[PDB]
PDB file of C-alpha atoms in Angstrom:
ATOM      1  CA  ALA A   1     -17.190   4.920 -12.675  1.00 15.31           C
ATOM      2  CA  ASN A   2     -17.766   1.433 -14.090  1.00 14.81           C
ATOM      3  CA  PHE A   3     -20.433   0.777 -16.721  1.00 15.59           C
ATOM      4  CA  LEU A   4     -21.560  -2.738 -17.632  1.00 16.34           C
ATOM      5  CA  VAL A   5     -24.172  -3.219 -20.361  1.00 18.18           C
ATOM      6  CA  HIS A   6     -25.794  -6.526 -21.333  1.00 19.26           C
ATOM      7  CA  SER A   7     -28.329  -6.677 -24.154  1.00 21.52           C
ATOM      8  CA  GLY A   8     -29.855  -8.932 -26.796  1.00 18.72           C
ATOM      9  CA  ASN A   9     -28.033 -12.179 -25.997  1.00 18.42           C
ATOM     10  CA  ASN A  10     -29.748 -15.450 -26.932  1.00 17.52           C
ATOM     11  CA  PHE A  11     -28.738 -18.566 -24.983  1.00 19.48           C
ATOM     12  CA  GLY A  12     -29.960 -21.914 -26.266  1.00 14.76           C
ATOM     13  CA  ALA A  13     -29.313 -24.266 -23.351  1.00 12.99           C
ATOM     14  CA  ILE A  14     -27.103 -24.082 -20.254  1.00 11.39           C
ATOM     15  CA  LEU A  15     -26.063 -27.091 -18.162  1.00 10.51           C
ATOM     16  CA  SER A  16     -23.866 -27.219 -15.041  1.00 12.75           C
ATOM     17  CA  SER A  17     -22.357 -23.812 -15.747  1.00 14.63           C
ATOM     18  CA  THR A  18     -21.297 -20.791 -13.714  1.00 13.17           C
ATOM     19  CA  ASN A  19     -21.271 -17.060 -14.468  1.00 15.38           C
ATOM     20  CA  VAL A  20     -23.088 -17.212 -17.800  1.00 13.26           C
ATOM     21  CA  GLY A  21     -24.629 -14.073 -19.273  1.00 14.81           C
ATOM     22  CA  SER A  22     -24.002 -12.166 -16.047  1.00 12.24           C
ATOM     23  CA  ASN A  23     -22.479  -8.847 -15.014  1.00 12.01           C
ATOM     24  CA  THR A  24     -20.035 -10.017 -12.343  1.00 13.76           C
ATOM     25  CA  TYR A  25     -18.265  -7.333 -10.330  1.00 13.66           C
TER      26      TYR A  25
ATOM     27  CA  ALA B   1     -20.573   4.856  -8.957  1.00 12.43           C
ATOM     28  CA  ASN B   2     -21.209   1.428 -10.486  1.00 13.02           C
ATOM     29  CA  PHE B   3     -23.879   0.908 -13.146  1.00 12.44           C
ATOM     30  CA  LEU B   4     -25.070  -2.554 -14.172  1.00 10.06           C
ATOM     31  CA  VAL B   5     -27.678  -2.896 -16.926  1.00  9.91           C
ATOM     32  CA  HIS B   6     -29.360  -6.139 -18.008  1.00 10.43           C
ATOM     33  CA  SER B   7     -31.885  -6.151 -20.843  1.00 12.83           C
ATOM     34  CA  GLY B   8     -33.443  -8.289 -23.561  1.00 14.45           C
ATOM     35  CA  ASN B   9     -31.688 -11.596 -22.859  1.00 16.23           C
ATOM     36  CA  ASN B  10     -33.463 -14.802 -23.905  1.00 14.84           C
ATOM     37  CA  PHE B  11     -32.521 -17.996 -22.051  1.00 15.18           C
ATOM     38  CA  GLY B  12     -33.801 -21.277 -23.446  1.00 13.98           C
ATOM     39  CA  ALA B  13     -33.214 -23.733 -20.606  1.00 13.60           C
ATOM     40  CA  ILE B  14     -31.013 -23.692 -17.496  1.00 12.82           C
ATOM     41  CA  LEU B  15     -30.040 -26.787 -15.496  1.00 15.12           C
ATOM     42  CA  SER B  16     -27.861 -27.054 -12.372  1.00 15.70           C
ATOM     43  CA  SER B  17     -26.283 -23.658 -12.964  1.00 17.15           C
ATOM     44  CA  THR B  18     -25.175 -20.724 -10.831  1.00 16.95           C
ATOM     45  CA  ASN B  19     -25.071 -16.971 -11.467  1.00 14.44           C
ATOM     46  CA  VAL B  20     -26.877 -16.982 -14.811  1.00 14.91           C
ATOM     47  CA  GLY B  21     -28.352 -13.768 -16.186  1.00 16.47           C
ATOM     48  CA  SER B  22     -27.702 -11.978 -12.899  1.00 13.39           C
ATOM     49  CA  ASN B  23     -26.119  -8.723 -11.754  1.00 15.20           C
ATOM     50  CA  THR B  24     -23.708 -10.026  -9.114  1.00 18.84           C
ATOM     51  CA  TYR B  25     -21.896  -7.442  -7.009  1.00 21.38           C
TER      52      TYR B  25
ATOM     53  CA  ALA C   1     -23.963   4.735  -5.313  1.00 20.53           C
ATOM     54  CA  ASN C   2     -24.660   1.366  -6.944  1.00 20.79           C
ATOM     55  CA  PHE C   3     -27.327   0.978  -9.628  1.00 20.60           C
ATOM     56  CA  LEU C   4     -28.581  -2.428 -10.760  1.00 22.24           C
ATOM     57  CA  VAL C   5     -31.184  -2.638 -13.532  1.00 23.04           C
ATOM     58  CA  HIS C   6     -32.926  -5.814 -14.714  1.00 20.66           C
ATOM     59  CA  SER C   7     -35.439  -5.692 -17.559  1.00 17.49           C
ATOM     60  CA  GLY C   8     -37.026  -7.719 -20.344  1.00 18.47           C
ATOM     61  CA  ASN C   9     -35.340 -11.080 -19.732  1.00 18.61           C
ATOM     62  CA  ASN C  10     -37.173 -14.217 -20.878  1.00 18.35           C
ATOM     63  CA  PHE C  11     -36.304 -17.482 -19.115  1.00 19.53           C
ATOM     64  CA  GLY C  12     -37.643 -20.696 -20.610  1.00 17.40           C
ATOM     65  CA  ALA C  13     -37.115 -23.244 -17.840  1.00 15.86           C
ATOM     66  CA  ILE C  14     -34.929 -23.336 -14.723  1.00 20.11           C
ATOM     67  CA  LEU C  15     -34.027 -26.508 -12.810  1.00 17.27           C
ATOM     68  CA  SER C  16     -31.866 -26.911  -9.687  1.00 14.44           C
ATOM     69  CA  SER C  17     -30.219 -23.530 -10.174  1.00 10.06           C
ATOM     70  CA  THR C  18     -29.061 -20.683  -7.952  1.00  9.12           C
ATOM     71  CA  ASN C  19     -28.881 -16.917  -8.477  1.00 15.60           C
ATOM     72  CA  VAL C  20     -30.673 -16.792 -11.826  1.00 16.54           C
ATOM     73  CA  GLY C  21     -32.077 -13.512 -13.112  1.00 15.43           C
ATOM     74  CA  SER C  22     -31.406 -11.832  -9.773  1.00 17.88           C
ATOM     75  CA  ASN C  23     -29.764  -8.644  -8.526  1.00 19.44           C
ATOM     76  CA  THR C  24     -27.391 -10.071  -5.917  1.00 19.17           C
ATOM     77  CA  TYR C  25     -25.537  -7.586  -3.730  1.00 18.85           C
TER      78      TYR C  25
ATOM     79  CA  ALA D   1     -27.368   4.582  -1.681  1.00 20.83           C
ATOM     80  CA  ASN D   2     -28.127   1.278  -3.413  1.00 21.28           C
ATOM     81  CA  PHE D   3     -30.787   1.025  -6.120  1.00 19.83           C
ATOM     82  CA  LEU D   4     -32.106  -2.319  -7.359  1.00 20.14           C
ATOM     83  CA  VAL D   5     -34.697  -2.393 -10.149  1.00 17.83           C
ATOM     84  CA  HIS D   6     -36.498  -5.495 -11.432  1.00 18.13           C
ATOM     85  CA  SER D   7     -38.991  -5.237 -14.284  1.00 17.87           C
ATOM     86  CA  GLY D   8     -40.606  -7.147 -17.137  1.00 20.89           C
ATOM     87  CA  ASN D   9     -38.994 -10.559 -16.615  1.00 20.86           C
ATOM     88  CA  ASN D  10     -40.886 -13.622 -17.861  1.00 24.07           C
ATOM     89  CA  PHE D  11     -40.096 -16.956 -16.191  1.00 23.45           C
ATOM     90  CA  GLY D  12     -41.494 -20.094 -17.786  1.00 21.44           C
ATOM     91  CA  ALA D  13     -41.036 -22.734 -15.089  1.00 20.59           C
ATOM     92  CA  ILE D  14     -38.870 -22.963 -11.965  1.00 16.37           C
ATOM     93  CA  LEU D  15     -38.045 -26.207 -10.144  1.00 16.00           C
ATOM     94  CA  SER D  16     -35.911 -26.749  -7.023  1.00 18.51           C
ATOM     95  CA  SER D  17     -34.190 -23.389  -7.402  1.00 17.68           C
ATOM     96  CA  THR D  18     -32.986 -20.634  -5.091  1.00 19.88           C
ATOM     97  CA  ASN D  19     -32.723 -16.859  -5.503  1.00 21.82           C
ATOM     98  CA  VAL D  20     -34.493 -16.599  -8.857  1.00 22.33           C
ATOM     99  CA  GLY D  21     -35.819 -13.252 -10.054  1.00 22.02           C
ATOM    100  CA  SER D  22     -35.133 -11.686  -6.662  1.00 21.21           C
ATOM    101  CA  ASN D  23     -33.431  -8.572  -5.315  1.00 20.94           C
ATOM    102  CA  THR D  24     -31.104 -10.123  -2.736  1.00 25.10           C
ATOM    103  CA  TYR D  25     -29.211  -7.743  -0.469  1.00 25.48           C
TER     104      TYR D  25
ATOM    105  CA  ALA E   1     -13.843   4.960 -16.407  1.00 26.14           C
ATOM    106  CA  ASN E   2     -14.350   1.419 -17.709  1.00 29.41           C
ATOM    107  CA  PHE E   3     -17.015   0.626 -20.306  1.00 28.06           C
ATOM    108  CA  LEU E   4     -18.071  -2.940 -21.100  1.00 25.29           C
ATOM    109  CA  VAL E   5     -20.683  -3.561 -23.801  1.00 26.38           C
ATOM    110  CA  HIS E   6     -22.239  -6.930 -24.659  1.00 27.02           C
ATOM    111  CA  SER E   7     -24.782  -7.225 -27.465  1.00 26.93           C
ATOM    112  CA  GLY E   8     -26.269  -9.591 -30.026  1.00 24.99           C
ATOM    113  CA  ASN E   9     -24.377 -12.775 -29.133  1.00 26.72           C
ATOM    114  CA  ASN E  10     -26.027 -16.108 -29.958  1.00 28.89           C
ATOM    115  CA  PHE E  11     -24.944 -19.139 -27.915  1.00 29.19           C
ATOM    116  CA  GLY E  12     -26.099 -22.551 -29.087  1.00 25.57           C
ATOM    117  CA  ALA E  13     -25.392 -24.795 -26.103  1.00 22.02           C
ATOM    118  CA  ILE E  14     -23.175 -24.467 -23.022  1.00 20.63           C
ATOM    119  CA  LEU E  15     -22.063 -27.388 -20.841  1.00 20.16           C
ATOM    120  CA  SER E  16     -19.853 -27.368 -17.726  1.00 20.34           C
ATOM    121  CA  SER E  17     -18.417 -23.956 -18.547  1.00 18.52           C
ATOM    122  CA  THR E  18     -17.414 -20.851 -16.614  1.00 18.42           C
ATOM    123  CA  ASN E  19     -17.469 -17.146 -17.487  1.00 18.03           C
ATOM    124  CA  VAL E  20     -19.296 -17.440 -20.805  1.00 16.78           C
ATOM    125  CA  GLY E  21     -20.909 -14.382 -22.368  1.00 19.95           C
ATOM    126  CA  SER E  22     -20.310 -12.363 -19.208  1.00 21.01           C
ATOM    127  CA  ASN E  23     -18.853  -8.981 -18.286  1.00 20.19           C
ATOM    128  CA  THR E  24     -16.371 -10.015 -15.592  1.00 17.80           C
ATOM    129  CA  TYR E  25     -14.653  -7.231 -13.672  1.00 16.45           C
TER     130      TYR E  25
ATOM    131  CA  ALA F   1     -52.493 -57.018 -31.173  1.00 14.56           C
ATOM    132  CA  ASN F   2     -50.609 -53.838 -30.261  1.00 18.05           C
ATOM    133  CA  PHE F   3     -49.073 -53.365 -26.814  1.00 19.67           C
ATOM    134  CA  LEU F   4     -47.838 -49.981 -25.592  1.00 20.43           C
ATOM    135  CA  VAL F   5     -46.232 -49.706 -22.150  1.00 19.11           C
ATOM    136  CA  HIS F   6     -45.177 -46.470 -20.440  1.00 18.87           C
ATOM    137  CA  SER F   7     -43.537 -46.543 -17.016  1.00 24.27           C
ATOM    138  CA  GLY F   8     -41.193 -44.675 -14.693  1.00 23.59           C
ATOM    139  CA  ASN F   9     -40.473 -41.610 -16.838  1.00 25.38           C
ATOM    140  CA  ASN F  10     -39.492 -38.389 -15.053  1.00 22.29           C
ATOM    141  CA  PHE F  11     -40.137 -35.113 -16.892  1.00 19.06           C
ATOM    142  CA  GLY F  12     -38.642 -31.955 -15.431  1.00 19.47           C
ATOM    143  CA  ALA F  13     -40.469 -29.179 -17.275  1.00 20.45           C
ATOM    144  CA  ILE F  14     -42.483 -29.039 -20.506  1.00 20.13           C
ATOM    145  CA  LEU F  15     -43.270 -25.841 -22.423  1.00 19.58           C
ATOM    146  CA  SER F  16     -45.238 -25.394 -25.665  1.00 18.86           C
ATOM    147  CA  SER F  17     -44.851 -29.046 -26.614  1.00 19.14           C
ATOM    148  CA  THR F  18     -47.003 -31.715 -28.234  1.00 24.57           C
ATOM    149  CA  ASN F  19     -47.195 -35.491 -27.785  1.00 26.48           C
ATOM    150  CA  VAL F  20     -44.831 -35.762 -24.822  1.00 25.07           C
ATOM    151  CA  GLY F  21     -44.818 -38.893 -22.678  1.00 24.74           C
ATOM    152  CA  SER F  22     -47.937 -40.185 -24.419  1.00 27.35           C
ATOM    153  CA  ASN F  23     -49.089 -43.407 -26.063  1.00 30.57           C
ATOM    154  CA  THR F  24     -50.313 -42.071 -29.409  1.00 28.34           C
ATOM    155  CA  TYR F  25     -52.104 -44.514 -31.689  1.00 26.39           C
TER     156      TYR F  25
ATOM    157  CA  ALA G   1     -47.957 -58.264 -32.786  1.00 26.88           C
ATOM    158  CA  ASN G   2     -46.131 -55.021 -31.982  1.00 28.45           C
ATOM    159  CA  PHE G   3     -44.591 -54.412 -28.560  1.00 29.57           C
ATOM    160  CA  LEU G   4     -43.417 -50.968 -27.449  1.00 33.46           C
ATOM    161  CA  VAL G   5     -41.802 -50.554 -24.026  1.00 35.20           C
ATOM    162  CA  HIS G   6     -40.802 -47.247 -22.423  1.00 35.77           C
ATOM    163  CA  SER G   7     -39.147 -47.179 -19.006  1.00 34.38           C
ATOM    164  CA  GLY G   8     -36.830 -45.196 -16.754  1.00 34.20           C
ATOM    165  CA  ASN G   9     -36.178 -42.187 -18.995  1.00 32.83           C
ATOM    166  CA  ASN G  10     -35.251 -38.893 -17.317  1.00 34.03           C
ATOM    167  CA  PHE G  11     -35.968 -35.690 -19.254  1.00 34.47           C
ATOM    168  CA  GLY G  12     -34.529 -32.459 -17.900  1.00 38.04           C
ATOM    169  CA  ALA G  13     -36.415 -29.778 -19.821  1.00 39.40           C
ATOM    170  CA  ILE G  14     -38.446 -29.778 -23.044  1.00 40.06           C
ATOM    171  CA  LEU G  15     -39.303 -26.657 -25.057  1.00 39.91           C
ATOM    172  CA  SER G  16     -41.292 -26.349 -28.303  1.00 36.61           C
ATOM    173  CA  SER G  17     -40.838 -30.021 -29.139  1.00 36.05           C
ATOM    174  CA  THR G  18     -42.944 -32.780 -30.665  1.00 36.91           C
ATOM    175  CA  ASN G  19     -43.062 -36.544 -30.096  1.00 35.62           C
ATOM    176  CA  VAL G  20     -40.682 -36.676 -27.138  1.00 37.63           C
ATOM    177  CA  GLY G  21     -40.599 -39.737 -24.898  1.00 36.33           C
ATOM    178  CA  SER G  22     -43.699 -41.144 -26.582  1.00 37.58           C
ATOM    179  CA  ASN G  23     -44.797 -44.437 -28.119  1.00 36.89           C
ATOM    180  CA  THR G  24     -46.058 -43.229 -31.500  1.00 33.91           C
ATOM    181  CA  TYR G  25     -47.812 -45.777 -33.695  1.00 36.00           C
TER     182      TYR G  25
ATOM    183  CA  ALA H   1     -43.404 -59.420 -34.458  1.00 37.27           C
ATOM    184  CA  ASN H   2     -41.639 -56.122 -33.756  1.00 38.52           C
ATOM    185  CA  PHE H   3     -40.098 -55.383 -30.356  1.00 40.06           C
ATOM    186  CA  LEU H   4     -38.988 -51.888 -29.350  1.00 36.42           C
ATOM    187  CA  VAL H   5     -37.371 -51.344 -25.947  1.00 36.12           C
ATOM    188  CA  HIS H   6     -36.430 -47.974 -24.442  1.00 33.09           C
ATOM    189  CA  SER H   7     -34.765 -47.778 -21.036  1.00 32.28           C
ATOM    190  CA  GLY H   8     -32.479 -45.685 -18.849  1.00 32.85           C
ATOM    191  CA  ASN H   9     -31.894 -42.728 -21.179  1.00 29.71           C
ATOM    192  CA  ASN H  10     -31.026 -39.371 -19.600  1.00 33.09           C
ATOM    193  CA  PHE H  11     -31.811 -36.239 -21.626  1.00 33.94           C
ATOM    194  CA  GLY H  12     -30.432 -32.944 -20.369  1.00 31.83           C
ATOM    195  CA  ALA H  13     -32.377 -30.356 -22.359  1.00 31.87           C
ATOM    196  CA  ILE H  14     -34.417 -30.488 -25.573  1.00 30.00           C
ATOM    197  CA  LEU H  15     -35.341 -27.443 -27.671  1.00 28.87           C
ATOM    198  CA  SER H  16     -37.348 -27.267 -30.917  1.00 27.03           C
ATOM    199  CA  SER H  17     -36.825 -30.951 -31.648  1.00 26.89           C
ATOM    200  CA  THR H  18     -38.882 -33.794 -33.086  1.00 27.46           C
ATOM    201  CA  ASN H  19     -38.925 -37.540 -32.410  1.00 24.73           C
ATOM    202  CA  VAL H  20     -36.532 -37.542 -29.458  1.00 23.31           C
ATOM    203  CA  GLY H  21     -36.382 -40.536 -27.132  1.00 21.95           C
ATOM    204  CA  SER H  22     -39.460 -42.050 -28.764  1.00 23.25           C
ATOM    205  CA  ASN H  23     -40.498 -45.406 -30.201  1.00 23.37           C
ATOM    206  CA  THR H  24     -41.794 -44.320 -33.610  1.00 22.66           C
ATOM    207  CA  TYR H  25     -43.506 -46.964 -35.725  1.00 24.29           C
TER     208      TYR H  25
ATOM    209  CA  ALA I   1     -38.763 -60.554 -36.061  1.00 25.32           C
ATOM    210  CA  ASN I   2     -37.071 -57.197 -35.470  1.00 27.77           C
ATOM    211  CA  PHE I   3     -35.534 -56.318 -32.102  1.00 31.64           C
ATOM    212  CA  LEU I   4     -34.499 -52.769 -31.210  1.00 26.40           C
ATOM    213  CA  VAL I   5     -32.880 -52.085 -27.832  1.00 27.29           C
ATOM    214  CA  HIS I   6     -32.011 -48.648 -26.437  1.00 27.25           C
ATOM    215  CA  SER I   7     -30.337 -48.310 -23.046  1.00 28.76           C
ATOM    216  CA  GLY I   8     -28.089 -46.099 -20.936  1.00 31.76           C
ATOM    217  CA  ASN I   9     -27.582 -43.205 -23.359  1.00 30.81           C
ATOM    218  CA  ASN I  10     -26.784 -39.782 -21.889  1.00 31.57           C
ATOM    219  CA  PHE I  11     -27.648 -36.731 -24.005  1.00 31.57           C
ATOM    220  CA  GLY I  12     -26.337 -33.368 -22.859  1.00 29.87           C
ATOM    221  CA  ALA I  13     -28.350 -30.888 -24.918  1.00 27.42           C
ATOM    222  CA  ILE I  14     -30.400 -31.165 -28.116  1.00 27.90           C
ATOM    223  CA  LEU I  15     -31.402 -28.209 -30.302  1.00 25.95           C
ATOM    224  CA  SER I  16     -33.425 -28.178 -33.542  1.00 26.10           C
ATOM    225  CA  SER I  17     -32.821 -31.871 -34.163  1.00 25.73           C
ATOM    226  CA  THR I  18     -34.820 -34.803 -35.502  1.00 28.20           C
ATOM    227  CA  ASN I  19     -34.773 -38.527 -34.710  1.00 25.40           C
ATOM    228  CA  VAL I  20     -32.369 -38.383 -31.772  1.00 23.42           C
ATOM    229  CA  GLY I  21     -32.142 -41.299 -29.355  1.00 22.63           C
ATOM    230  CA  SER I  22     -35.192 -42.932 -30.924  1.00 20.54           C
ATOM    231  CA  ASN I  23     -36.159 -46.353 -32.253  1.00 20.30           C
ATOM    232  CA  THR I  24     -37.495 -45.403 -35.687  1.00 20.80           C
ATOM    233  CA  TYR I  25     -39.154 -48.148 -37.710  1.00 17.22           C
TER     234      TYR I  25
ATOM    235  CA  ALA J   1     -34.169 -61.634 -37.642  1.00 16.21           C
ATOM    236  CA  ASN J   2     -32.540 -58.228 -37.161  1.00 16.00           C
ATOM    237  CA  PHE J   3     -31.009 -57.216 -33.831  1.00 16.53           C
ATOM    238  CA  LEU J   4     -30.040 -53.621 -33.054  1.00 14.15           C
ATOM    239  CA  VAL J   5     -28.423 -52.799 -29.705  1.00 16.95           C
ATOM    240  CA  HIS J   6     -27.616 -49.305 -28.422  1.00 18.20           C
ATOM    241  CA  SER J   7     -25.938 -48.827 -25.050  1.00 15.63           C
ATOM    242  CA  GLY J   8     -23.727 -46.509 -23.019  1.00 16.10           C
ATOM    243  CA  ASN J   9     -23.283 -43.682 -25.534  1.00 18.11           C
ATOM    244  CA  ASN J  10     -22.546 -40.199 -24.174  1.00 18.11           C
ATOM    245  CA  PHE J  11     -23.478 -37.235 -26.383  1.00 20.29           C
ATOM    246  CA  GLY J  12     -22.227 -33.813 -25.348  1.00 21.17           C
ATOM    247  CA  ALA J  13     -24.293 -31.438 -27.476  1.00 20.97           C
ATOM    248  CA  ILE J  14     -26.348 -31.855 -30.657  1.00 23.51           C
ATOM    249  CA  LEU J  15     -27.415 -28.989 -32.930  1.00 20.44           C
ATOM    250  CA  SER J  16     -29.446 -29.099 -36.163  1.00 22.30           C
ATOM    251  CA  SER J  17     -28.775 -32.797 -36.668  1.00 21.73           C
ATOM    252  CA  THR J  18     -30.720 -35.806 -37.907  1.00 19.77           C
ATOM    253  CA  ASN J  19     -30.600 -39.503 -37.000  1.00 18.71           C
ATOM    254  CA  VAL J  20     -28.190 -39.221 -34.077  1.00 19.50           C
ATOM    255  CA  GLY J  21     -27.899 -42.055 -31.569  1.00 16.84           C
ATOM    256  CA  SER J  22     -30.921 -43.794 -33.075  1.00 16.14           C
ATOM    257  CA  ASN J  23     -31.827 -47.273 -34.292  1.00 21.97           C
ATOM    258  CA  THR J  24     -33.190 -46.459 -37.749  1.00 23.37           C
ATOM    259  CA  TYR J  25     -34.803 -49.297 -39.678  1.00 24.61           C
TER     260      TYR J  25
END
């Protein structure tokens, strides 16, 4: 089993970016 | 089994970006 | 079994972006 | 079995974007 | 079993970046 | 005499803002 | 005499801001 | 006489800011 | 006479800032 | 007479700053 948890992350500004704040499997 | 959890993430502004705040499998 | 959960995510503004705040399988 | 859950996501403004806030299979 | 936990991370500004604030498997 | 000229300005997305792209006197 | 000229300015995304791209007198 | 000229400025993303890309007198 | 000229300035991302890319008099 | 010229300046990311890339008089 694989568990991925993402919580309470604040991102100000994202430009021309990939795989940011994501659960990539 | 694979578990992906995404919660409570604040994103200010996103421009020309890919796979942001997503559960990609 | 695969479980993907998406909850309580606030997105300010999205421009010319792909796969944002999505459950991609 | 595949389970995809999408809830309580607030999107401010979306322009020229693809696959945003969607359950893509 | 693999457990990945992401919480309470503040990101000011992200430009032309990859795999930032993400659980990559 | 006061001259104010506003031309050819492209605005992507505006949220909770005041006095944007305006000639304020 | 006061001359203010505003032309050809591209703004991606504006959030919770004041006096942006404006001729304020 | 006072001359203020604003041209060809590209702004990616603006958050919680004041007097950005403006001719303030 | 006072001449202020602003041209061809690229700004990536601006957060919680004042008097950025402006002709302040 | 006072002449101020601003051209071709690239700014990556600005946070909590004052009087950046501006013609202040």
